[PDB]
Amino acid sequence: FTQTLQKDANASSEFYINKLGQTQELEDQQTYKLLAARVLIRENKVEQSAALLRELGELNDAQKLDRALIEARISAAKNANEVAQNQLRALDLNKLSPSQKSRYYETLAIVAENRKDMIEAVKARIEMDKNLTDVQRHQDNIDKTWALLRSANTGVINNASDEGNAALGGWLTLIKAYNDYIRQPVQLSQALQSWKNAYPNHAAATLFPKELLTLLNFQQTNVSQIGLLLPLSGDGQILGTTIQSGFNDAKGNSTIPVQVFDTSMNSVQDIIAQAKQAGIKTLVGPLLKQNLDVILADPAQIQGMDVLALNATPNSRAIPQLCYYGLSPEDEAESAANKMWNDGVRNPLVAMPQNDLGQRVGNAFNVRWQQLAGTDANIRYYNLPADVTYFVQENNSTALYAVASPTELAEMKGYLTNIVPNLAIYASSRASASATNTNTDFIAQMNGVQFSDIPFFKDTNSPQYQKLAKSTGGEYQLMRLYAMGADAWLLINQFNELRQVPGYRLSGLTGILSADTNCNVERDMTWYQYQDGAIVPV
Ligand SMILES: [Cl-]
């Protein structure tokens, strides 16, 4: 049974540990412990793997050989590169099975990657590939190899020879094509299609890297007419009208015809049917969450159409040719988690209103905080500003993120500074309004607080700002919606890049725009802090 070690381990570590109770044959026990230890690494559990190796008892030669492989991988994971390399070179490569050789070369690749030697890491993964048999493992190594090449600096790539190594030659041409043409994705598509015919026996010609799949058959954005879905009468009229103005101002003299569909006068399902009958293949909108959910209730309704929805809901998911562009507080909370991390905040307090909005935004913050910190944030819900008094204690260290009005946040800062006067406070754009941000007192009172908002608020002297501030009556909320409409024009004209070019970024009035894997539009916010009675960008 010891021969199992020479084969891929396809089960979970749990599965292998269970087999210990089912078996009382002492030699089989060690084998199962080695199998669990091996998998435990790929589950990113180095210490658990190391602990299990210490539980091993008497081992035959084959079991000792496999333990030494795992030990080398653990050393590589711990960045003990010299030790790991010495450990591998102490093994007899000719005694290893193909599966064991694949593990050997992956460890070598990790060592090289630790050392920032990308070409050497790629060469080790090329050797790993020769020994792999399973398709998913083939694909995973292809994707890791591509990621190594993408991280290499262009100088090393452009000067590297293939060394007579056909696999390396194909890889080098592929990354050069990417680096040379990613800015011209139509030309990159042509180069990638050529690459498949130039290296048809290359491993990646059959299993293309996942990051390149949308580029291989890229299609240029070519908008011919747009249907604009907004609430333009009744309730929500101000919202849609303002978004429409930003949209139309950005559109300027474009000859692209835009047909306007007032969602307050007709159901979205009828509107989409109308647009299809009229031959419209491009929609901007709808805005209201419930109207987006109509689309998501039967996504085939928009088959053949590119759609930039102006909201996102808990039901948003990867749907062909559908992208989601909202100004959600959930996404500002994510920007808050990132900022507080990079600010060096640890153990953050998150004060949310006690309502569904609070849960969603608090949950959004915590999800992101777990990613950056590997632990939970302290989310707490309030009904009144006063409630935050009991969120902190005298002997804390810590920092706060709050979603609340400018007045409510003012009151909060008063209650919290009596318990911890040096508390770093963070807030969302809901805390920034014109009346308060121009008052000498509110600005010295809120001195210290920093908040996220759109970059449009950087230049409060320019003409575009002055004109909009006047036309909106100084209401920051409406200025944000105007900017959203302008950015919607930007996005719909870069729709295929947004969908198909990984990492594509746009400078918008509402922030730096990019798209996640569901084509939800992410926004890199501007942060502002009150300083010397003045508001300065950070
Ligand atoms: Cl709508």
What pairs with residue 406 in β-bridges?
none
Q: From the CA of 293, how far away is ligand 1's center (Å)?
A: 10
Q: From the CA of 101, how far away is ligand 1's center (Å)?
A: 58
CA distance 155 to 160: 9
CA distances in angstroms from 371 to 212, 314, 366, listed in the order given: 25, 20, 9
Q: From the CA of 317, how far away is ligand 1's center (Å)?
A: 19
Q: From the CA of 332, how far away is ligand 1's center (Å)?
A: 22
What pairs with residue 284 in β-bridges?
228, 308
Q: From the CA of 244, how far away is ligand 1's center (Å)?
A: 12
> Which among 314, 320, 265, 267 is positioned nearest to 289, based on CA atoms?
314
Q: From the CA of 228, how far away is ligand 1's center (Å)?
A: 10
In this structure, the number of other CB atoms found within 10 A of the CB of residue 68 comes to: 14
**DSSP output for 91-128:** S-GGGS-HHHHHHHHHHHHHHHHHTT-HHHHHHHHHHH
- Beta strands of 290-442 (E only): which ranges? 306-309, 322-324, 348-353, 378-382, 399-402, 424-427
Tokens 């064991």 map to which residue? 100
Q: Which two tokens stand for residue 279?
A: 């031959």
In this structure, the number of other CB atoms found within 10 A of the CB of residue 64 comes to: 12
Q: From the CA of 492, how far away is ligand 1's center (Å)?
A: 17
Residues within 5 Å of ion ligand 1, judged at the Cβ atom: 231, 263, 286-288, 291
Q: Which two tokens stand for residue 229?
A: 């879905």
Phi, psi of 346 (to 5 degrees): -130, 140
Q: Which residues 6+ apart lie within 8 Å of 379 measured at CB?
A: 350, 352, 362, 363, 365, 366
Q: Which two tokens stand for residue 428?
A: 């969302």
Q: From the CA of 289, how far away is ligand 1's center (Å)?
A: 8
Q: From the CA of 286, how far away is ligand 1's center (Å)?
A: 4
Q: Which residues 6+ apart lie within 8 Å of 237 measured at CB?
A: 231, 264
Please confirm whether the linkage preceding 286 is cis (ω < 30° from 0): yes
| CB of 501 closer than 8 Å to CB of 185 | yes
Signed CA dihedral, 337, 339, 344, 348: sign only: negative
CA distance 103 to 49: 15
> Which among 143, 92, 151 is positioned nearest to 119, based on CA atoms?
151
**Experimental determination technique:** X-ray
In angstroms, what is the resolution? 2.0
What is the b/e burial string over 227-249, where b = at least 16 CB atoms within 10 angstroms of the residue's CB?
bbbbbbeeeeeebbbbbbbbbbe
Q: From the CA of 330, how far away is ligand 1's center (Å)?
A: 20
**Strands 526-531 and 534-537, bridge-based pairing:** antiparallel
Q: From the CA of 287, how far away is ligand 1's center (Å)?
A: 4
| CB of 299 closer than 8 Å to CB of 322 | yes
Q: From the CA of 485, how far away is ligand 1's center (Å)?
A: 13
Q: From the CA of 259, how far away is ligand 1's center (Å)?
A: 15
| CB of 460 closer than 8 Å to CB of 436 | no
| CB of 487 closer than 8 Å to CB of 325 | yes
CA distance 72 to 460: 59
Contacts made by residues 215-220, CB under 8 angstroms, sequence distance 24+: 215/182, 215/185, 215/188, 215/189, 215/500, 215/501, 216/189, 216/192, 217/189, 218/185, 218/186, 218/188, 218/189, 218/496, 218/500, 218/501, 219/496, 219/500, 220/185, 220/186, 220/496
Q: From the CA of 121, how far away is ligand 1's center (Å)?
A: 51
CA distance 446 to 464: 28
CA distance 67 to 414: 60
